[PDB]
Design a binder for these strands. Structure first.
Lengths: 93, 107, 98, 81, 451, 93, 107, 83, 98
DNA sequence: ACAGGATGTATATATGTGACACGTGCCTGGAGACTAGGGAGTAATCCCCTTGGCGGTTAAAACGCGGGGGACAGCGCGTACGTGCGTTTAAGCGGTGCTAGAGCTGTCTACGACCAATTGAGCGGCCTCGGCACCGGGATTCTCCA
DNA sequence: TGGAGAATCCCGGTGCCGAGGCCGCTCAATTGGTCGTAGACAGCTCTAGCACCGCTTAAACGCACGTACGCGCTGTCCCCCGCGTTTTAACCGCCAAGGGGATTACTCCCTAGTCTCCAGGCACGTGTCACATATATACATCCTGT
């Protein structure tokens, strides 16, 4: 029946980055698979971190350390900056 | 009690609610913090924006208005960091990066 | 007097042509038959989605292209331009597959 | 049944794959070597694809089974699920 | 040669005419295979009451053309002759020419292409048809020392003084290879060397058995059935069919399809077939037992049906499964997953306000599955998977618990297991409540399998 | 605090296979790490198999499939046989 | 009722109860079947028995009655299946298989 | 104090011993620098991941478990130090 | 009149001795100082368990020995016996580390 | 080096068309407001284990000297690969049909989670006796200079 | 083709620090219930996988020929190896100092769970133009005589 996807959000991001560029259906599926794969990597690393350290929950800092472990080089620095900015904006109001 | 989406509150485009649900049902931990879905959604949106910005540049370099798998693969392989992240990943219908060894050339 | 290019230039043009494109370089029916013949030894009377065979073909072409890049590095290392089975075997051994 | 379909991976097809990989001259035995390599890779992937299919109690090998087999082998594939 | 007696026979347009022609051709040490083969093929192909117009001129023209082709392509002076023994190269050249007579577009297993009448007049021929064409051409060449070899499915041509040398001149549904490697693999395609050695009498038997009266997927021709009945009964009166179990099975099937007085009932012929399998082939043929089991399945008597299927499993116990013999696997799969479940379901429905409540029927079913499991062990290719497990659990479910409890698994009837997989079921099943999860886990495990 | 290890059970299995051969402490640590790593591999593959098929339970069948996926060749065959034998003996009792 | 370990009921040396507790608390799935710990413990015992038998044979080929990491590595690397299983791992305090290439060795 | 290089402590004889364990007869003179570069790269990666594991757990001491976890992240499982 | 050996044989004796043993081939203190300096580059005032440095040493020695086996294969491929830096680069590029 | 002959391929213009972006119904999952219970933050305490230094031994590293073995370059050749071409073969597209099996809905029943009891097992200390490396003498085996 | 050299193993005695056995003793695995619900099973239904035929034309095939290149051979030299001597910093042993890893106890707050409600994201349907394809023009490039 219903199928969940990241297509609408990928398209929103694309329109806010390249306002005049569309995206094919195969490229949309590739981007969807990329988002799923990265989500799984970060979540699995966060689960492993929360199990090694004797914890039971996944917090913001578990995701931050998972991003720091998985993402290479400057991707990690910029992704950490974006995530912390989002969390501060969320909890501010 | 007007409803404002968590994603809108966080200033993102990616779904905070869907990411939270996936983290919950995904069997990663018994409990999932409140800020964890927001952080993960922000990271995912950043990575998607990065690869799509490079893909849009690659598509424009070929004088085209649509992003196809080839442009995604060019964006991935030409950027060292994204190439390192997507190391073992195959981008289907994406071809290969044009490159010939200097030895195999009449100069 | 017919015009024939010096050997090793059509090869370069074909290198450019096949690196510029993204077409599946193996024919589809023979590869589908090969996949079925191979799968016919793990379980009798299987069925394949067309997407399954397409996924196998994309993976196999990518694997062979990567393997031939490694093999070409091996061939150049040994002061050659032609790739020989010893180059393929060296690349497979170094990657740990063999 | 199906027999000796590995020769369906023709010498011109192997040459096209090598040219995309970027090789100029190809020896005469690279064809047999590559057919053996491809058959080994396909057997390794198909075994895991068939195992995933059996575990789901299906008779049809889905594209998700193939991409799961490739992911298990360490060769993630994007664009099929 | 073109005998004057064979021309003086003057075959008319009547079934009794065909019977008399066959009888006349069966009075000599070597019947004219191509003559009778072409006549039967022409009648079938033309038909596939307006009896086909038998034309001796057209048959003679086709025979002359075939003889010219075979003589021009294959000449005795081109190869040495060992004083009454044909050489390997001779048969290889005959097979090469017979294959070169064909075209690129294959038959695709199409029906009505099993006779020489189509092969001479076309470019299509199936595997058994190709082997029989090879044999007929060799016989017309005067090389009588060669003979056709019939496995249960795969057909080829043997030769030499005593048939010591073998060559599978035809593919599997590649001209010269030995059969010893295939026998060494214990595969059903070769019957472990127990394949029959066919003489020209057996060639007539093969030609009459190969007739396919199926006009299409839905309709059949009664005249072909009556022809096959008459010819088979005559050849059995000769006694030649005795060594050919498939011939007896087909004759019994025809008899039950339409009764004929003065002749033994189908069950007697089925038992005669299984006995010929029991004596002459070291109890290695399978299709006699499946013929009998299908005959019982047609009727509402499941006891003997399950007994026959268990016997079939005991026959297949010894073999090893490979990709080569897929057909026997598909027949066993059909039997175990579509007819036995339905048969037991109907029997249970009849029981619900007997076929069930009998320990012997359950013992037969268990022995059938035990034979399948023993077949799997040691095979390069796995046999059992979840598709088998679900229906095995269902079939054990059809039986009541106290009914199953009257069974003894040693080393109610007593029954032992020769298979390793069933050594766990020896206590998992035959309990008050069947544990489906454990049974399916035990069955679907890929143990006892080589690769 | 209590430290969980397979030292006792590894020692019992060793006495089962080699009655008069001892094992060093470092070799015991290696064997304990081996058992932990293989347990983690098999259980994780079973978890992925459960998740793919929308099943919320890890059962013997998924463990068997994970063993077919992870262990190579004759190791898979014999380990599968051992697991089926042990589960059959457990259930029947 | 009289106590009885599940390990003894299934005829296993390894702890079925401890494996069940680990499967429950490790967050592998929402539920774990009753036979899953028995199957997993049986597989673990089989693998341990195989590798320990090989290590004991290697130690016996060295006139020693105490297994040390060197013998564990000898057993693992001299087995064509355990080598595939333990391919990405390194046994501490274990050497390397004695192997000098034939072309390297002078004739 | 702040350590200056300390990479030369991976000595030429030690690199020769490692090469001999690999089964190599002759060693070119530039291997002794190429291998030091290789080892510095490998250790930089593994130490980066071990320090991340340590710092996340609010520790100041790099445990052996952090090192074996960092190695397992690289796909280089280590046996005998826990795990 | 001293009696000496061919350069080949003592190398083989070293190979035999260093392959029959399990000893650590790098001296402990210089490696520990190297590890501490590399960590100092990341976070300051960091402390190490002795087991931590031992684990790092085991991993590093195993990695370098595997790399040198691959380098030996590369050098044999180019019809040599001396391992040269180009061999190390070839092994590290084929294995995907570069 | 340099200029023509011929080249595959770049540049430009156009019709088609089938996929892409958008509008709508809607319903399913996500947002807002209690409830409560346990996970995790915080603080004080113990003491294990990390760092730091001194001091003597001798193992191993550093250095220098032949010297000869192996890397590198040049030459010759002959063979095995690329290049074109006409011929053959089977891929590819396009309908046409069948049906097996994937996906889903409704029972309903057996199985796993929770919980109270508690007892036998598995872990933390603590002897204790044999396995293994060390030392030392004798025998063995392969290997550069005459 | 026969003698000196350097490892290397085989065999006997030792006394030792480490594995195996012994002793408490808690604590978590077993027993026995319920109880809800996950999935086992049955029937259904649409879809998409398999099979078949026929035409077209793209691509594989076999063959001949030239020739670029792989490989063997030879010569030079340079630079890596083995060896003897000095030296230097690892290493073993010991002693202190303290800081930070474990542990425990209190509490508070944050997230799971429930319920209500509604709006935003998905499936379905529709205009429409981006790009593929065909042809006309064009243009850098490769091979060969100059």
């Amino acid at each position: 029946s219903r199928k969940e996807s990241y297509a609408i959000y990928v398209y929103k991001v694309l329109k806010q980055v390249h306002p005049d560029t569309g995206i094919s259906s195969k490229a949309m599926s590739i981007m969807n698979s990329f988002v799923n794969d990265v989500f799984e990597r970060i979540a699995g690393e966060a689960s492993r971190l929360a199990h090694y350290n004797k914890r039971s929950t996944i917090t913001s800092r578990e995701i931050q350390t998972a991003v720091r472990l998985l993402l290479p080089g400057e991707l990690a620095k910029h992704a950490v900056s974006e995530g912390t900015k989002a969390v501060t904006k969320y909890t501010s109001a | 009690a007007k409803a404002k989406t968590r994603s809108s509150r966080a200033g993102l485009q990616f779904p905070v609610g869907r990411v939270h649900r996936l983290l919950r049902k995904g069997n990663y931990a018994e409990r999932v913090g409140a800020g964890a879905p927001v952080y993960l959604a922000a990271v995912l949106e950043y990575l998607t924006a990065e690869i799509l910005e490079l893909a849009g540049n690659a598509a424009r370099d070929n004088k085209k208005t649509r992003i196809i798998p080839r442009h995604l693969q060019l964006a991935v392989r030409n950027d060292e960091e994204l190439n390192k992240l997507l190391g073992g990943v195959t981008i289907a219908q994406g071809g290969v990066l044009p490159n010939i060894q200097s030895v195999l050339l009449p100069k | 007097k017919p015009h024939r290019y010096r050997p090793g230039t059509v090869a370069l043009r074909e290198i450019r042509r096949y690196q510029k494109s993204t077409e599946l370089l193996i024919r589809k029916l023979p590869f589908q038959r090969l996949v079925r013949e191979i799968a016919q030894d793990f379980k009798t009377d299987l069925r394949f989605q067309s997407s399954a065979v397409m996924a196998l073909q994309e993976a196999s072409e990518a694997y062979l292209v990567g393997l031939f890049e490694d093999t070409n590095l091996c061939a150049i290392h040994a002061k050659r331009v032609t790739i020989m089975p010893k180059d393929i075997q060296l690349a497979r051994r170094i990657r740990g597959e063999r | 049944v199906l027999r000796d379909n590995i020769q369906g991976i023709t010498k011109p097809a192997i040459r096209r794959l090598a040219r995309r990989g970027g090789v100029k001259r190809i020896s005469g035995l690279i064809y047999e070597e590559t057919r053996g390599v491809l058959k080994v890779f396909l057997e390794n992937v198909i075994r895991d694809a068939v195992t995933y299919t059996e575990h789901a109690k299906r008779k049809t090998v889905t594209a998700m089974d193939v991409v799961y087999a490739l992911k298990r082998q360490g060769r993630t594939l994007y664009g099929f699920g | 040669g073109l005998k004057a007696a064979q021309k003086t026979l003057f075959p008319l347009r009547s079934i009794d005419d065909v019977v008399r022609l066959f009888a006349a051709e069966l009075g000599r040490e070597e019947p004219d295979l191509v003559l009778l083969s072409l006549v039967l093929g022409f009648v079938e192909h033309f038909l596939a009451t307006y009896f086909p117009v038998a034309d001796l001129s057209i048959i003679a023209a086709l025979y002359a053309r075939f003889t010219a082709q075979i003589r021009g392509a294959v000449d005795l002076s081109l190869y040495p002759r060992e004083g009454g023994v044909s050489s390997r190269e001779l048969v290889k050249k005959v097979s090469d020419v017979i294959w070169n007579s064909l075209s690129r577009s294959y038959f695709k297993d199409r029906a009505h292409i099993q006779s020489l009448f189509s092969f001479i007049t076309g470019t299509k021929l199936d595997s058994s048809g190709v082997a029989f064409a090879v044999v007929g051409a060799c016989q017309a060449l005067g090389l009588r020392d060669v003979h056709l070899a019939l496995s249960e499915d795969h057909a080829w041509v043997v030769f030499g003084p005593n048939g010591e040398q073998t060559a599978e001149v035809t593919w599997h549904g590649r001209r010269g290879q030995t059969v010893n490697a295939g026998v060494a693999e214990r595969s059903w395609l070769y019957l472990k060397g127990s394949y029959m050695r066919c003489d020209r009498k057996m060639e007539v038997a093969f030609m009459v058995c190969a007739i396919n009266p199926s006009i299409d997927l839905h309709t059949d021709s009664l005249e072909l059935l009556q022809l096959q009945q008459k010819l088979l009964w005559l050849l059995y009166d000769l006694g030649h069919l005795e060594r050919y179990p498939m011939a007896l099975g087909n004759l019994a099937d025809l008899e039950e399809l339409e009764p004929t007085p003065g002749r033994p009932d189908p069950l007697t012929l089925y038992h005669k077939g299984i006995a010929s399998a029991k004596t002459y082939y070291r109890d290695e043929h399978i299709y006699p037992y499946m013929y009998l089991a299908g005959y019982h399945c047609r009727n509402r008597n499941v006891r003997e049906a399950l007994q026959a299927w268990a016997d079939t499993a005991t026959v297949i116990q010894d073999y090893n499964y490979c990709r080569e013999d897929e057909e026997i696997y598909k027949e066993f799969f059909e039997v175990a997953n579509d007819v036995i479940p339905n048969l037991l379901k109907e029997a249970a429905s009849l029981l619900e306000a007997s076929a069930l409540q009998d320990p012997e029927c359950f013992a037969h079913l268990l022995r059938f599955y035990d034979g399948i499991c023993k077949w799997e062990e040691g095979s390069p290719t796995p046999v059992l998977h979840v598709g088998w497990a679900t229906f095995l659990v269902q079939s054990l479910g059809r039986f009541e618990g106290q009914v199953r409890q009257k069974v003894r698994i040693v080393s109610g009837p007593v029954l032992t297991f020769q298979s390793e997989k069933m050594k766990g079921m020896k206590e998992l099943l035959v309990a008050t409540k069947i544990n489906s999860s454990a049974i399916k886990l035990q069955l679907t495990a890929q143990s006892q399998v080589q690769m």
